[PDB]
């Protein structure tokens, strides 16, 4: 049995095992806050995710297992997977904490374009590597709903990992939201990601904001002034009556041509961009589309751009007992089995 210490980090005490030594806090995720950490056993640095309050609540609760079942599934080099997953408990009367273990990840994509000047090349990778992943997770089922730059993990040499996806079922940005999720219409697709990719891509290539709304009706009109305004059909899409009486009553106003709006970028980030920015999520390319656009030219292996394991989800639709979410969180704690260290082979 492993040695475990307590460490006051964040004000709240840590209790890890004598593995992981020197945590140092390196912000909040989702439902939970994270120290970097080194790994004695493999000299690696890790970050260390300890969840907040996994089980006050049926919904802390299923969150707890929802992420737990997810983190085990993602094994993908874009996509934040789990090296480790511990608990100071000796059984499971005694569960009540999480700790969640990945590699360290020094920095967010708004560390990446903050002081930089990004060459076109290099924003070829960052989105690459972006839509590589959203490629993987959306092969299982699963979309993020809510990407954005604060939710890409990025280490000293640019490589990219998606976190926090597949969650929820504090004031955010809403930027980067897919309009169909920031409005709440009625049906929408994996094509949610896309949208936020292009607005991610955008940024990157100018350096600025895209849609920078200060409100929902604000992002709106911003939106509409770039794609011009949309169609009857999209009203379909729309529940409240008062929302679609207000879009219908906006003046028409036309699609830009985005060669004009993307003064100098190079064109086929443009054509791309205008294949991602579409309100009508149908028309949206997809990620695995996207991967194969010839922007991407220089990067693009389609031996190296897997799929998922199938995922099965049947337990998003069960209301369980708290203490049935906690059983089960405890029987996927104990049965998780560490990747080896190397997992990859020369192509
Ligand atoms: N520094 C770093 N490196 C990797 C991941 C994270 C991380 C995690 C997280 C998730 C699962 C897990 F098992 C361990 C940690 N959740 C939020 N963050 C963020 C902390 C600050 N914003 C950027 C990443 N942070
Ligand atoms: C922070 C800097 N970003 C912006 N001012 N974005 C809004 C503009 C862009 C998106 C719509 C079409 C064009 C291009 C004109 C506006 C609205
Ligand atoms: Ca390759
Ligand atoms: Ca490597
Ligand atoms: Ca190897
Ligand atoms: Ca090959
Ligand atoms: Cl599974």
New binding site residues.
Partial sequence: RPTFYRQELNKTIWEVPERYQNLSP?????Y?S?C?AFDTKTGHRV???KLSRPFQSIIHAKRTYRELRL?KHMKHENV?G?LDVFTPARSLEEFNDVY???????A?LNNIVKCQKLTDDHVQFLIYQILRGLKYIHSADIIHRDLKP?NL?VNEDSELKI??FGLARYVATRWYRAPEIMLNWMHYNQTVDIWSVGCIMAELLTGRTLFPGTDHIDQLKLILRLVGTPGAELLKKISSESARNYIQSLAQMPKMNFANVFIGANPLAVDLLEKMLVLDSDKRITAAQALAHAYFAQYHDPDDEPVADPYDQSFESRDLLIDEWKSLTYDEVISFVPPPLDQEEME
């Fill in positions: 390196v912000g909040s995720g989702a939970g994270v970097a970050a260390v995710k983190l934040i789990l969640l273990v990945t590699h360290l990840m020094g967010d604060s993990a976190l926090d």
